[PDB]
Symmetry: D2
Subunit: 639 residues, 4 copies
């Protein structure tokens, strides 16, 4: 189950303290994201496992170069200039870095999290011992990483062909102490690269044979961004899947949409797996119990089936689960590889001439799956706001009671459409815009880094959408509970006033059915308004009871005493609520987290906090990883 | 390996005789393609394996319907109207079909018969799971319609592929009930009203029973049909493109090292290892790689150490495209081998239980196809330009009069046009979901629309493959002629050095030049003193005079030049003229070259061959389009393991 | 006003008998469309006006080439091979055509309509006297055009129009391999084609091959018919927004002149809509509806109605501006080099980027028009938004076996979804082409073909919209006649049963106020809104005032005796008025009477397809312009 | 709405004052000698119901698009000069015959 795999990734992300870098131990996207996001996470470069192969490779290269062997990027020019030969070994490598320090700072940069991640991947790539880089440079990299030092890197300039040439040149730039490369030390300090190395007790390196190319010729930045993108995509996917369950509960859906047999006959692994999760989440739900009751009232006048954003959520999610899982595998494969050219095969004494394409394509695919995830959340959000489709819920989830001055989540509804519209636009592909580049030497190139940044932007928006959706659903939980409490109050007042005014058994029964049947939010605004659905039904029932008993003083008395008692008792129960079925729900951890740990309450005109203040707290908890606590809680026992 | 798997799909496509439909035996995309494209392929609905469960389900549905059980789309309305109930069971079903016969025929566009017949197959197969409630008799009629080449004329557009391809499948339903306004084709010319079609094959119109209208329209059969034949073709063309990278390496004088197993072991994307393993195997004993190594040992330090990316990075480029196309095939097959219907009758448990994968994966496959096309455009571009082609003439023009021979220039122009439209097609369809059907279908997959765009992208890829293979056979010829021409030049220069009595030092320099200068730089006029053969000869003559200085030498050099301009052009013309009326013989790509040249009856293009570039590429494209191209492909890969 | 200019284009397309090709008389998108669609339209190449300059140019080029002048594509190679020189003038031109006959026929080709339009445009370019083409070749083109002869041309291959134009050249030189159509049926090799119209294959002279192939006549040809259709369909959509307002019970106030008074397209579309609705009998019903329970009904219409003029504004501008741009390209010399014989020189430039870019813009505007139509249709199908209309516009009365226009609703979403996808740009996919000598290129033909496909879909959406709207006219008219029956029945029964003035009045109100289509299925069902309302009022009257209880019970009894039969009767009568006073009468009449349709229901045997197809065919073939012009007459 | 929120001194609305200072909206209003407004009839909607932000960004976009276009046009001339182009491509009669303005 993909649910297990993702829980495994989340647990690894939180628990790891030391990333082992040795050329055999795999780095997962959870490891990359943990280093990027938790500064207590340290790298350990293991000498006993890979120092030997590195020093052998490095020395092989330096010797071969000095004896004038004809090797690409070592004694020949780069890319389109590979026909040029030199014996100025060091000068060849330094001229490479110089030509590649060619990005520009706008008024924007790759963030520190990305840059350090790239530094991690570049270090790891060296541990396979194919690069010819010196051990010392690797130790310097490990130390730069653990000391929280990183170059400031221009956003743009990589087409990610054989490598992310320009952004990786800035890491090489820091390593050789270029004065014009600026480096961050922690969050506050910025100093030239020579001052940076000095403060952590390193000296500038002079580049040897192949070292400039080894340092720039990989796809480390794209894969860095793709790794945190893929970490986040896995978590947010599991979060979206889970909340489809919560959506069913609050919308009064039919849980049958998640029956294992519907999906066993149409067996997409992601479809089966998501249905399996949903069935489990909803199994003995106290909210489904209210749903069943709701549909038994006027059964034949209510929809037999839910709308597609609920009922076909497991089929919609299926391919999205598969896309995100396969892309995680593909990115991890890239993380755990020697991306570099030439590959040094020191054992058989050849430098091998070959080559970011896997990452570029899969980031395109994931961006389309993220767009699908946002489209599902938009459609669910839209249904929840419209009283015709929310099975009892008031429009915009406005508590009112005075609806003319309470527009509830109308603002969040508008923001949802804006989020989803930009998201769909973002999901056009990047890899279809390949230009013939670098004197036509890179006549194909992956554009992985650019595609990775767009998918990263796509996830940022999904987060916004998940934040709003979860907020709306806690609003709806509160509204359903209040609804239960209100209908009970109405039934009681009607039952007792029936006894008090001494109306026949028939009249009592007819009147109590109306109290049960009328959606309370259709008349909460003014329960004794003669034109609103409570009084409208009661009047119909009264005229009906007059005809059936034919072969009035008490009915006029019942009505009069209804507008004495009803509103006040309804107000009291609401007011009391403002200062329960969620307790038996699998989604209790989410509601408790949002309401208690974040300190929110049912939205209304009498709560001074804006929607912004409420959603922000939820967004922040999503952004920083705290949401995974209620998520793991909600999920435990699923196996 | 994906190679053996694709070889298996082609073998199944060619060899299958009968498609067994029984509710357990899997239908693959080759079966769907086989049924669509080979009318001798027959559908065999096996009663013994599934008739009994169909009748149980059928009978169960009717019984529950007549008892007034409340079951979606059986005693309730459909879609956004599911809150309406009736006991008018047959009219409920006929009213659904009526309302869905709502497409328009444009100007004439329609789903093709290949797609409609495929959809018919998939709808029949779905019914064999015994969950639908449809009568066994309706299934037999479908098998008979399929086997008799009758299909409804179906409008191109109208489906959003939510729970079903509602409008298109209403036309299959409209045929089975003999709606007179539903036109049916029988074979390729004949078109008649539905009642006449049914009579011509000995069936009578059906009266719809409970749930039967819904059963006929409520799955994603048209999108899945189109996507199946799309995935079959994607698999074939992918393999073709991978194989042709090898042939590109041979004719462009690439370095085979790009495909070495260690490069890909250290970056182990499954598609990367596997495409390279194939390429390595394809180029192992190549006589063209032999010419290549020979070419780079001449003026070694004045020549690129690496090839360009379109060659050198083809395994890395291909890897994700292989994975995309292979994973999409599995996804589409999973969809083929399912009961796409709602509600599901679970007659065993006495209950009724109430097109997305294909849309997304079609979007992904369209991106992979644009990527394959980008690879082809880039290779073809290198091949056309003398700066990047390592001895080939611009546009692969044979000449020798280049001012009146533009070679494959028109093809080059068209390749740009093909690639540009292709990159445009690869924008996603799934990002354009509208809230549909009174907001009941607020998500929908658009799978049929997406599948159609991927089909169009594949149609363009076929064009590009055809031109590329054509350009590569042109390049094979030019390489073989080049080799033969250089030998004549060497021989003539060698015999004239003797006749004229030139020193060994002079002879050495003059023979070096004849070997080193690319023949196609001076072919137009071999004795033109301003072209590279003579320039190089003149340079070496000045060098030999200066080296032998410590007269009659100049006299003999002058004689050498005079006699060269008497004899060399004639001997070069003769060898070329002879060639117009070998190393390809030792090459894994002989089957392609032999297929294009002898089986399709082509020749090296020039001003003297009267056939247009159109006429040559049309033959190759018709071969790719109709599957004949898989014979050389299978011959070429014979023995790969 | 853009509305006058569009009626001007439509008039011209209908009336033109002859296309004068003379080198100064402009060709409009309407002339191109007419030549392509009406075969009685003929080309008249006017010798007296342009033969002199063509011959002067032709001779200059021939003489200069013979003298050994260094002129691109005349004594030099083409494109990236322009460093190659030759004295072999004719062979140079023939080898260019040979190399460019490089399209493939897939299973597909440019339609004859486009191919003939390209031949027209090419002929026209030649009359400017800059090409060096011979007069004889131009006369041969006119003769080919007027005799319905045209080469079969592959769909793809131009980055913009070397390959496709090479097939026109191949016809003229009688290449065996080039296939020509003659009318609808006959297909023969080019040499046979020329023979049949009494022509001989040409031997190309200096610059001739290049002159025949070196401009963008195909992209411009497709662009021209595309722009003609976009103007016509634009005006159709604008007009039908007015018909949508009538059937949906919208508020005409959205079209008031001061709101907009000022994007020209915004002012002008509003000005049209205001006029179309000024004396509408349907707006009279709308006002009446909104005065019934005013404070319980929306104050504003939804955006797809209320903001239609603002939506349409940039769409009008885009289509109008693109039209001007295509016409500029039509009335130009696209060729290179440009021979300026007057001053004894050849001019080496690049005369089609304008068309590529604007086709991308227009494809976006067409997508925009479609979204509007989708949004209106959607509203119309949903009872919550249609102001009294039944869901799916289903007549019933048995809604459980009548799904009305639901199939059309579904189709509309498919249409719109595909349309939005199409509207992505083409010009952003420029590849570095032709040995990198065409490192920019416009892709105009490809873009034009995409916009053409986008219009195809818009026609589908308009045909469905117009069908829904006539369904909606019938339902409103039936609504009004049905409400009067209920009012009469309630009224006379109140008398017969002798209820007071108070009761009669409350019951009359309910009959007036309750939306009929909420109870038509079973008017006397106690759970449906009519009897729910009457029971509320009867209880009210009992309190505010016996044997009255007797008279009410008899009222309720005689209602399920009289009511359903009389409602059934008017509907049955209707299936076997306010539209008569509406500007939109010609559309309703055209669809109902001229196309022979009727209100859709379970009792009408025609499928939705049968109905919409007729409306589509009429849109596709231009008959829709007859009602369009009738509806618009008097608008100034 | 953030502009309206400032004008009415919402504490949750932060305001910028120059480059350095960020303060809650009531303290922002205080410093410029202004007091929170109490919204009267239609003032809320009048403040939010227009397309002022889109048009604002669109305005700085169009200004820049004009400047950069002219700069691109001008730099084609510079490219001609350094690449050894033929200036004949800009001769007026070529373009008079294809008169896109």
């Amino acid at each position: 189950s993909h649910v297990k795999d993702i829980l495994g990734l989340i647990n690894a992300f939180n628990e790891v303290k030391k990333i082992t870098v040795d050329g055999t131990t795999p780095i997962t996207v959870a490891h990359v994201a943990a280093l990027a996001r938790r500064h207590d996470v340290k790298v350990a470069l293991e000498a006993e496992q890979c120092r030997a192969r590195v020093e052998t490779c490095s020395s092989w290269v330096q010797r071969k170069a000095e004896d004038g062997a004809d090797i690409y990027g070592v004694t020949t020019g780069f890319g389109a200039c590979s026909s040029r030969r030199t014996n100025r070994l060091s000068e060849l490598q330094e001229s490479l870095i110089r030509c590649l320090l060619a990005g520009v700072f706008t008024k924007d940069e790759l963030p520190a999290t990305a840059t350090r991640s790239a530094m991690l991947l570049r270090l790891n790539s060296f541990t396979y011992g194919c690069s010819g880089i010196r051990w010392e440079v690797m130790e310097a990299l490990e130390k730069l990483l653990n000391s929280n030092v990183s170059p400031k890197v221009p956003l743009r300039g990589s087409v990610s062909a054989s490598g992310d040439l320009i952004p990786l040149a800035y890491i090489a730039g820091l390593l050789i102490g270029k004065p014009s490369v600026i480096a961050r030390i922690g969050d506050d300090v910025e100093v030239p690269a020579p001052e940076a190395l000095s403060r952590v007790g390193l000296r500038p390196f002079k580049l040897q044979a192949k070292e400039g190319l080894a340092l720039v010729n990989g796809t480390s930045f794209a894969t860095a961004v793709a790794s945190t993108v893929m970490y986040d995509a896995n978590v947010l996917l599991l979060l979206v899947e889970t909340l489809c369950g919560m959506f069913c509960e609050v919308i009064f859906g039919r849980e049958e949409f998640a029956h294992p047999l519907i999906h066993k006959v149409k067996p997409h692994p992601g479809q089966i797996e998501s249905a399996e999760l949903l069935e489990w989440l909803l199994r003995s739900s106290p909210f489904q119990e209210l749903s069943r009751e709701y549909y038994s009232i006027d059964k034949l006048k209510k929809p037999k089936q839910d709308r597609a954003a609920l009922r076909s959520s497991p089929q919609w999610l299926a391919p999205l689960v598969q896309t995100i899982r396969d892309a995680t595998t593909t990115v991890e494969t890239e993380v755990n590889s020697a991306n570099d050219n030439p590959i040094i095969d020191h054992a058989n004494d050849r430098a091998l001439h070959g080559a970011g394409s896997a990452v570029g394509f899969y980031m395109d695919y994931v961006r389309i799956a993220v767009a699908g995830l946002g489209k599902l959340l938009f459609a669910q959000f839209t249904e929840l706001m419209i009283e015709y489709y929310s099975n009892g819920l008031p429009g915009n989830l406005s508590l009112g009671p005075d609806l003319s001055v309470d527009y509830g989540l109308k603002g969040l509804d508008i923001a949802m459409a804006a989020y989803s519209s930009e998201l769909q636009y973002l999901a056009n592909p990047v890899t279809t815009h390949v230009h013939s580049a670098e004197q036509h030497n890179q006549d194909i190139n992956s554009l992985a880094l650019i595609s990775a940044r767009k998918t990263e932007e796509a996830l940022d928006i999904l987060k916004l959408m998940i934040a709003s959706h979860l907020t709306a659903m806690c609003q709806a939980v509160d509204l359903r509970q209040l609804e239960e409490a209100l209908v009970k109050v109405v039934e009681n007042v009607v039952s007792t006033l029936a006894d008090e005014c001494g109306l026949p058994n028939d009249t009592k029964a007819r009147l109590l059915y109306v109290a049960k049947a009328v959606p309370v939010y259709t008349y909460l605004e003014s329960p004794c308004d003669p034109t609103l659905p409570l009084l409208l039904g009661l009047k119909q029932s009264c005229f009906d009871t007059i005809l059936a008993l034919h072969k009035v003083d008490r009915l006029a008395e019942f009505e009069k005493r209804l507008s004495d008692r009803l509103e006040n008792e309804m107000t009291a129960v609401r007011v009391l609520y403002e200062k329960v079925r969620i307790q038996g729900s699998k989604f209790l951890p989410f509601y408790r987290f949002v309401r208690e740990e974040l300190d929110t309450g049912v939205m209304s005109a009498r709560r001074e906090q804006t929607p912004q203040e409420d959603v922000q707290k939820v967004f922040d908890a999503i952004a920083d990883g705290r949401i995974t606590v209620p998520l793991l809680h909600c999920l435990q026992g699923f196996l």
